[PDB]
Amino acid sequence: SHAVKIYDTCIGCTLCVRACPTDVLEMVPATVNAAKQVASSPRVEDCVGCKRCETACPTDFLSIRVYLQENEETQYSLGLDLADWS
Amino acid sequence: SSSKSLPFLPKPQNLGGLAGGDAEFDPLGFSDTFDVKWLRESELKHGRVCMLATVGFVAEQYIQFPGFTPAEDALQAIYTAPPNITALLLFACGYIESSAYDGKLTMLDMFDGEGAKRAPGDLNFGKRFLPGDKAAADDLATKELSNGRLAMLAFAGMVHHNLVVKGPLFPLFPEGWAGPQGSWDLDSTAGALN
Amino acid sequence: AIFRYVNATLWSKAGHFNKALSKGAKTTTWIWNLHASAHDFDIQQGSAGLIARKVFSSGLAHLSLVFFWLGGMHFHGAYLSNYSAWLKDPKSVAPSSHIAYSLVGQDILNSYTSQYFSGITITSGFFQLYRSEGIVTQSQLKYACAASLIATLICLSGSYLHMQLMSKFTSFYKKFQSLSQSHLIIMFGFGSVSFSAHQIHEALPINSLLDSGIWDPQLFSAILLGTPSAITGKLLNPSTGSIFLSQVAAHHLAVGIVFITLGLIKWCNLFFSRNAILSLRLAYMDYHAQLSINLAVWASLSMVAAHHLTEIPVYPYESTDYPTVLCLFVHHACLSGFFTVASGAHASIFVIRQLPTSEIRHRDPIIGHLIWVCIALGLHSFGLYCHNDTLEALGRPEDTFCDNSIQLKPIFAKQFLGLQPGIEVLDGKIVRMTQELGTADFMVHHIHAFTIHVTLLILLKGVLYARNSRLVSDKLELGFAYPCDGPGRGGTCQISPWDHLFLAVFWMYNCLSVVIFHYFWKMQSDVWGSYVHHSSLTCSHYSQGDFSVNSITINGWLRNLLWSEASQVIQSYALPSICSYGFIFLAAHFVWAFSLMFLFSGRAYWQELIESILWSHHKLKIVPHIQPRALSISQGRAVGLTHYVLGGIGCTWAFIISRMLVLTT
Amino acid sequence: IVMKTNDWDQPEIQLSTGASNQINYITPVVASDDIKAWLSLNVNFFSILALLTVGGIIEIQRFFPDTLYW
Amino acid sequence: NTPEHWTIKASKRLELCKDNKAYKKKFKDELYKTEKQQKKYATGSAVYARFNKKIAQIKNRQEAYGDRLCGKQDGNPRVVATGEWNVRASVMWPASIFLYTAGWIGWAGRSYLIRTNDETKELNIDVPLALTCMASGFSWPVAAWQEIVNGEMAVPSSQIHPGGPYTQS
Numbered sequence A: 001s002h003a004v005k006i007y008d009t010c011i012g013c014t015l016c017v018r019a020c021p022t023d024v025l026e027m028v029p030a031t032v033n034a035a036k037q038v039a040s041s042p043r044v045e046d047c048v049g050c051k052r053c054e055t056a057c058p059t060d061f062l063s064i065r066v067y068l069q070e071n072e073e074t075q076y077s078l079g080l081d082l083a084d085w086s
Numbered sequence B: 001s002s003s004k005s006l007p008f009l010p011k012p013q014n015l016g017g018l019a020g021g022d023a024e025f026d027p028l029g030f031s032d033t034f035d036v037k038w039l040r041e042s043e044l045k046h047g048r049v050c051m052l053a054t055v056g057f058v059a060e061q062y063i064q065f066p067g068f069t070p071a072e073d074a075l076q077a078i079y080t081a082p083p084n085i086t087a088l089l090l091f092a093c094g095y096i097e098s099s100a101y102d103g104k105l106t107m108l109d110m111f112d113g114e115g116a117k118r119a120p121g122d123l124n125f126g127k128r129f130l131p132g133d134k135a136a137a138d139d140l141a142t143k144e145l146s147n148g149r150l151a152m153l154a155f156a157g158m159v160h161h162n163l164v165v166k167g168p169l170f171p172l173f174p175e176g177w178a179g180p181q182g183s184w185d186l187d188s189t190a191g192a193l194n
Numbered sequence C: 001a002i003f004r005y006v007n008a009t010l011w012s013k014a015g016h017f018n019k020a021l022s023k024g025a026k027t028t029t030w031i032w033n034l035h036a037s038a039h040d041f042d043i044q045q046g047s048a049g050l051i052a053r054k055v056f057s058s059g060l061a062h063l064s065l066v067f068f069w070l071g072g073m074h075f076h077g078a079y080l081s082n083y084s085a086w087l088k089d090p091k092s093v094a095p096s097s098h099i100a101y102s103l104v105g106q107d108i109l110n111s112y113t114s115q116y117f118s119g120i121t122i123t124s125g126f127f128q129l130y131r132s133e134g135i136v137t138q139s140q141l142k143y144a145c146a147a148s149l150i151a152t153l154i155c156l157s158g159s160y161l162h163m164q165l166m167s168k169f170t171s172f173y174k175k176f177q178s179l180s181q182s183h184l185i186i187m188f189g190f191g192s193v194s195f196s197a198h199q200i201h202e203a204l205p206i207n208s209l210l211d212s213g214i215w216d217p218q219l220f221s222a223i224l225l226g227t228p229s230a231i232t233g234k235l236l237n238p239s240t241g242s243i244f245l246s247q248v249a250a251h252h253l254a255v256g257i258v259f260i261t262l263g264l265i266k267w268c269n270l271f272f273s274r275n276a277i278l279s280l281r282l283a284y285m286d287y288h289a290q291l292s293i294n295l296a297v298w299a300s301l302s303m304v305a306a307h308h309l310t311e312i313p314v315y316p317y318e319s320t321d322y323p324t325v326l327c328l329f330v331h332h333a334c335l336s337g338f339f340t341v342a343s344g345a346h347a348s349i350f351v352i353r354q355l356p357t358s359e360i361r362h363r364d365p366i367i368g369h370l371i372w373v374c375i376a377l378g379l380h381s382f383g384l385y386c387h388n389d390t391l392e393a394l395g396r397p398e399d400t401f402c403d404n405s406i407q408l409k410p411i412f413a414k415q416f417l418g419l420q421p422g423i424e425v426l427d428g429k430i431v432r433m434t435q436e437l438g439t440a441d442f443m444v445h446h447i448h449a450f451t452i453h454v455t456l457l458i459l460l461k462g463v464l465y466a467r468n469s470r471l472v473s474d475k476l477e478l479g480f481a482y483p484c485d486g487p488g489r490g491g492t493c494q495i496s497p498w499d500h501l502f503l504a505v506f507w508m509y510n511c512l513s514v515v516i517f518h519y520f521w522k523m524q525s526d527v528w529g530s531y532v533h534h535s536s537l538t539c540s541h542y543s544q545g546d547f548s549v550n551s552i553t554i555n556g557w558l559r560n561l562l563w564s565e566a567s568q569v570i571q572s573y574a575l576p577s578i579c580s581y582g583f584i585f586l587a588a589h590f591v592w593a594f595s596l597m598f599l600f601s602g603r604a605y606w607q608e609l610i611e612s613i614l615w616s617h618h619k620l621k622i623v624p625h626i627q628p629r630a631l632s633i634s635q636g637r638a639v640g641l642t643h644y645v646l647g648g649i650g651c652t653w654a655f656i657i658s659r660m661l662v663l664t665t
Numbered sequence D: 001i002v003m004k005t006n007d008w009d010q011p012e013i014q015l016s017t018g019a020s021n022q023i024n025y026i027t028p029v030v031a032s033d034d035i036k037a038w039l040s041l042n043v044n045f046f047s048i049l050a051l052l053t054v055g056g057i058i059e060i061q062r063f064f065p066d067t068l069y070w
Numbered sequence E: 001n002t003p004e005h006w007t008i009k010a011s012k013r014l015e016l017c018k019d020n021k022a023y024k025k026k027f028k029d030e031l032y033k034t035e036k037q038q039k040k041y042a043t044g045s046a047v048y049a050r051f052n053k054k055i056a057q058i059k060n061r062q063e064a065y066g067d068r069l070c071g072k073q074d075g076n077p078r079v080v081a082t083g084e085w086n087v088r089a090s091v092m093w094p095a096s097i098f099l100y101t102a103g104w105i106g107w108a109g110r111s112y113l114i115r116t117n118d119e120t121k122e123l124n125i126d127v128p129l130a131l132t133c134m135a136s137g138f139s140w141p142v143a144a145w146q147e148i149v150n151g152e153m154a155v156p157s158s159q160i161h162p163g164g165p166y167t168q169s
């Protein structure tokens, strides 16, 4: 699976969460920024690696980073449809 | 307000206050686009160079410096003249050009900051003879501009007459002259088609 | 109707049409997007009425452009051509309405065409077209040019007017029944009848006089006079080597009558199976659906034109004007391919913007079977060539697929003309000759089928999987032209219908290049050439009939077609006629190679290089406020594709034209 | 009758209640300022510059061919 | 072995073109080809006149190039790139004039950019100012040296983006 990390530069605009195609991310309460919320990545097992969160991130450099891990590819991260590894 | 020279066109508003503009004549709005100070400096320079040029163009056909092989067609005098002396002329012209403007030679540098208060064409040369009374001073400036413009047109005419006649200036029509029809001979689009 | 709203104020805005370009010129990507979306009237600011306005007015403006081009052609023929010399003696003088300047030694390009004329030999068949039309005078050509220019002005005025005449209530463009009926009865039926009238009344007497040898002004200013009872096409004009123009006029009269009859039966509702097409009628009332259908129709008609203009001779002396027939075939084949890939593109756009038809719901079997047929066709067809190569190299010709060895006879390729035995000749040239099909023709035709099927596979996959797929389920949300969906799910590069076209264009170009090479080599080897003396002639062909012996191997194609026949273009530098063709050969090679830059590289390298370069500009205080950017991914693909196709087409163009020009002169 | 169409190109359209004898100009309203702005657009500026440069080079080649002076 | 041999004129691989057999043969062949091409057309033809003009051009080219050096084997005129100004076909004159013109273009442009400092002006050119800068760029050598000396040309590297970060922050 890929690694989706969030950094404190986050401003809690929720655009990453809204752009998530498989609902990997969710906003959580925080005090670091004025919006009082920061995106989290609890369901990183479903991350496919499309980097749409990264596309939608406003900050100067991304407060959300998706690191691709081709060696640890799973069926959920590969979006397998015709074949099942479960 | 219609222009005096062209009563069917609007009067130019940015060229006022300069001698020789009695017939306000800027149909293309060059004074509007660019700075009239630079335009007038260039006009004076062209007038002076061109009147000196007409006098020299006439003189060279007859009289030349000792040595200095002649060229009846004064257009060829540049090639026929001593290259070192021609380079000396260029050197003197460059020295004068640099010194007169102190180094602010460009369209932006000149008439910028210091030197803007300087009159467009005033190089402080031979100003001891300028009449004190403003009426006579303006009349003299207008006379200079008129002679310069006439000299520009006259030099253009001299050069092109030499080109058409392929010969010296003074005989206006050489022996056997029949017309300038055959001078512009290089092929054109319409000419080649017809 | 209100023309006070057309002002030049918007001319300097440069991006008013697209709302996404409101933040003008923050980067060079803005310039590129402006150009890319200039003519995408659907996504531009306004309404559906405005979209229709723009579509129709742009069609009229392009009509005016084409009329201007035709008028320029007529003017060049009239004033800058040797049409007089060609008309009096077509064989000796090559057509040339093209003259070059003497700027930098460029006068070398002009070549001897006649005693008093020197220029560039044209290959468009315009001289033959004029001769068929009956145009034999500079005055006639001049008035044709004047008519074309007047038509250009009229079309320009029509576009400008219709930009405001049509309002939001305008609906005449949605009247499909009226549109089709008018086009079928007037534009096609009445048009064909009127052109038959023109032929009968003007071209037939003039052409008959020209065939006889009469050049009298009074005569220039009794149908079926010379045509025997022989079936049309079975007997060519002995003095011209083309179908009788009276037969052509009768053809046009019959075609116009048939079109009028079809229109009238449709008007009377005689056609009954409306329900079988009602689904398509409801679904495909869209700009892009109609554009795709029309593009495919015109592509197929262009291919049929390419085949017929050569196989069936109808223009005077075009049969013996070998460069003309070859260039016509190649040009129309290329247009067929381009318009077919265009039809695929706009089918994909229609699927994206509108609801698709129900054949998309079993798309997996369709594309799966197409994939299988493509694989099997390619394997068999190309592996026969590879087998021939390997076995011939090993030294076993008896094991190869050829007429002498194992032979694959095209049993289904059967005659239908029923022509008499022999060939038709005209002044030392073979105007018409039967093409004899064998193993080489079998193999090359199956190669053609393979390439066509692979191009169709790419286009159909792009069309059917445009809305969604197993990989990505929101391709509809992504749109039509996007680079990818991300590096995820393994990588979603070029999943868009735009990229499917970007690949189908490569495959169409490959198919058309093979088709061009097949036609060129087969015609040179087995059809074209001269003859040496009931009389029997031994026919000396330009390529010496080597297609049937050498075309069975890829090495034979490489040697006897490319290397052997590139002698003219490769050795064209000293020759005044074709030095330009040699230089264009070289430059097209350069451009094709230069395209690989964009086809192989990626955006990020160039963006980083641009930033490193911009460091120095910033250091020296050269700050471009339209910040430089690397070309987008889709733009890089488009640029690479354009340069690739242009370079390949230029190489083929120069090679074939140089060969033909040298051989015929 | 005046109607708002909600079209930027033709905000309003007028219909006649009967036969009318009125001026309806079909010519567009073009201003010299608008034309000057359009030509000031970087494209026209640089295209004119490049066309003049190319013409100058071509004319130099015409007038002094083969660089005999060099 | 001598300072005199430093000049490209005193080289064993080159010869004056007027004395080069290969150069003479090449030109003779070009003239023969042009005349043969001319002979095809009629005497009083416009193409005949054009071919006469081309033949004259070739002869004048031969006369002009006779002075230039060219290799013995091929006899094609060569371009001297040692730096000798007083030599035929010297590269210095074209080099100097091109360098002046290119610096003119660069200076003009940089000056427009500095004066405008706006993407809107970059897109819609301020034609008056652009022409003013183009005209002003003639003194670019002196102006550029003065700005370099006085520090108005280059800005410290700490004022511009250095690039990507190569270490931990």
Ligand SMILES: CC(=O)O[C@H]1CC(C)(C)C(=C=C/C(C)=C/C=C/C(C)=C/C=C/C=C(C)/C=C/C=C(C)/C=C/[C@@]23O[C@]2(C)C[C@@H](O)CC3(C)C)[C@](C)(O)C1
Binding pocket: B051, B052, B054, B055, B125, B126, B127, B129, B147, B148, B150, B151, B153, B154, B155, B156, B157, B158, B161, B169, B172
């Ligand atoms: C202390 C200090 O600083 O010194 C002082 C000294 C001093 C003297 C006091 C000063 C001054 C003033 C000077 C030097 C003024 C000079 C003025 C001149 C030379 C004017 C020439 C005009 C020529 C014309 C109109 C030609 C016209 C020609 C025409 C119309 C020609 C026309 C034809 O050629 C054409 C065009 C074709 C020919 O075929 C036919 C003809 C007719 C010949 C200063 C400035 O204070 C400086």
Ligand SMILES: CC1=C(/C=C/C(C)=C/C=C/C(C)=C\C=C\C=C(C)\C=C\C=C(C)\C=C\C2=C(C)CCCC2(C)C)C(C)(C)CCC1
Binding pocket: C620, E081, E082, E083, E102, E103, E104, E105, E106, E107, E110, E140, E144
């Ligand atoms: C002599 C000679 C030679 C040699 C040469 C050389 C070796 C040279 C060198 C050179 C060099 C080694 C140089 C250096 C440089 C450096 C630097 C550091 C620079 C910089 C620059 C700049 C900064 C610029 C700026 C500007 C201007 C001025 C103008 C335009 C714009 C701009 C902004 C770009 C040869 C043999 C070749 C040839 C013959 C002669």
Ligand SMILES: CC1=C(C/C=C(\C)CCC[C@H](C)CCC[C@H](C)CCCC(C)C)C(=O)c2ccccc2C1=O
Binding pocket: C597, C598, C599, C601, C602, C603, C606, C607, C629, C630, C631, C632, C633, C635, C636, C637
């Ligand atoms: C080279 C390259 C670039 C860099 C190329 C750029 C930025 C193009 C430069 C555009 C110029 C400024 C347009 C002007 C036209 C040419 C300079 C014209 C030259 C004409 C000659 C005859 C002189 C990309 O950005 C890129 C992006 C994605 C895939 C592949 C590539 C790619 O291959």
